[PDB]
Amino acid sequence: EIVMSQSPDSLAVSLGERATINCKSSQSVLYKSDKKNYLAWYQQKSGQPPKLLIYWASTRESGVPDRFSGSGSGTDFTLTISSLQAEDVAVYYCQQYYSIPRTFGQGTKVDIKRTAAAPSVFIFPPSDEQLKSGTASVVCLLNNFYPREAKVQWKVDNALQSGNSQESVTEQDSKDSTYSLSSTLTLSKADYEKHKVYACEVTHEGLSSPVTKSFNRGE
Amino acid sequence: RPFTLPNLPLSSLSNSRAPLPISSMGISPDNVQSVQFQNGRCTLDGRLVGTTPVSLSHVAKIRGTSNGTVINLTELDGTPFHPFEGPAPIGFPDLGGCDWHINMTQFGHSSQTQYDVDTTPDTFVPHLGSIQANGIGSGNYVGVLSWISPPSHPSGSQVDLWKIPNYGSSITEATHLAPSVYPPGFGEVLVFFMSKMPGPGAYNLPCLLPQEYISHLASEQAPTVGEAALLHYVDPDTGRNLGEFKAYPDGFLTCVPNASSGPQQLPINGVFVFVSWVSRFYQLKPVGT
Amino acid sequence: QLVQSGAEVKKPGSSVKVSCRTSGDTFNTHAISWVRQAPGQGLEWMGGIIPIFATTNYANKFQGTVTISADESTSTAYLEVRSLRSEDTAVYYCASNRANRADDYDYYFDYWGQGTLVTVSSASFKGPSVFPLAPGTAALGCLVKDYFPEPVTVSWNSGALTSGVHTFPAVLQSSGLYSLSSVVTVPSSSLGTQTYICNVNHKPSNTKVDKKVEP
Ligand SMILES: [Mg+2]
Ligand SMILES: [Mg+2]
Ligand SMILES: [Mg+2]
Ligand SMILES: [Mg+2]
Ligand SMILES: [Mg+2]
Ligand code: NA
Ligand code: NA
Ligand code: NA
Known about the structure:
heterotrimer, A: mainly beta, C: Immunoglobulin-like, Immunoglobulin-like, 6-stranded mixed sheet, elongated, binds magnesium ion, binds sodium ion, antiviral protein, IgA
């Protein structure tokens, strides 16, 4: 099989700046007989099927804005967003259609770059009703930060927790180019009522010092 | 020096495009108006043509040094290949319409490696002495064609061994190809010597001359006295004449089929025997008559 | 233009048959491929068929467990996946590309279907429990917990509240059920005057929940 390799994995480029995405095929996809490169580029936004941008390496699909362009030949190909717009935030895939099986690159995520922004941290104790059900979920909200990388640590009675938390990260907000993250600590109602202080500790590039949000059980 | 062909039955001889025994004679499909094989080409007075070697030990083989990305080719003895001599080094495989699977070995090292060859991309340029390594690690190798499969490109293609590969680049054409070979007409069609080729199908490899004919002609170098050599295909045990054929100076055989009565309907253990030199338009009797 | 069948839930080891219907013109001039996409992962070509030539091919890893077929009379191609495993949970896409002959179909993808979600799991269908995330700027929200299968949607005040809403992607808990939170930031002076309700809809279980979040 012809293996497709894209680089970078993720790309953050400021509005109106140019984004370049490289794609290399393990075997040339340039048919000597017709001189065509059997390579295409696709754009996929979450919840949607992919959309054709470029074909034959450099041909722009009808209806694609001409700030999209493809170049390269043989084994090395390049997609360039000459002036990035908010509507171009998506995952981009290259694909060879030279042979069976058809193969895609791993994809390159492109987000809008902006200045660093520290998260606003919020902590939520489990609700009245959920405790009656027999399980306590403690939620820590990291809101409207950039860039995406962020570390969250849970400290129950000032003891580091491990393996009982799940994170979820939103996609980039199109209005302010930020991300938000939820960290949910899930305990049995028994262990929840055997401890007092529940703390969420946040590390991020936009913070010169860790931020701890805590609460006491029942206050 | 009178013209002769080897006194050996066809079924004990070898294909000249791969080291395979000959198992039948055949004709081309109706939609094959000509062939341009680069191996198995030798004139009747003994001039090798294309990439044809004297010996089967060179047939359908490659030699070169891989760097992991490309294999830089040489002749099979390691001496340099020069583009003006032909479309590829001597003995280089000439099977079009298929992917190749070549068994790679090395002098001084243990093990064999399968080399999978798609002959269509812009990295397959044997006329420039360079073909893609396709995962073959660095080192010097000798490779021999082992089995074939359908072309990777175009997808859905069938194996078609009446073709030759594209030897040149997407911009520069391979020079010094052996010329095309055409049916002479007026009933005469080209005669091919067939071999079964391993691979995921019922693959049959045609060639214009058995390899043992080629090294015989190269040795004898008998002057081509006429425009065509009239031959009899004779039974070796009885001497009975099974059909008339003509051998032409460029190095190919013809007959007049009448049809489920062509050279494929003849026994394969017969011997071709030179009868006399005759005109181009000497009218052959139909096979079976 | 490529119409796929609805979402499916299958138990491990069972089989799933997914359909893709197109116009007759497209059906007889195209190859029809199946491309799947695991959650948060890339695109994986599984195989294809050229209906008018009845030729098929498959990627090696889907050989033996996958069969692709076509019904000329309904212009519908089918994908069958047997011996389902958890890692087979994905959105299965139908995709087409031009095919002029059996050996002339090396073209970029023409159209895409909207996709068909196949969830491979032992979990039972279950609507979520919606728990409040109770409260310058204040943050509040709703915990949408223990539902199966995907998807769920959340809105706020019947869609009247939109600014500052962050509804997080779901996560698959070890219990086999999904969970997510939806949060919103509002003026702290609104916590006494303005009512906040999250509208949670889990159509697969026919469950609709409105939960007022109180300070
Ligand atoms: Mg769009
Ligand atoms: Mg010849
Ligand atoms: Mg040699
Ligand atoms: Mg060794
Ligand atoms: Mg076109
Ligand atoms: Na193999
Ligand atoms: Na070596
Ligand atoms: Na082609």
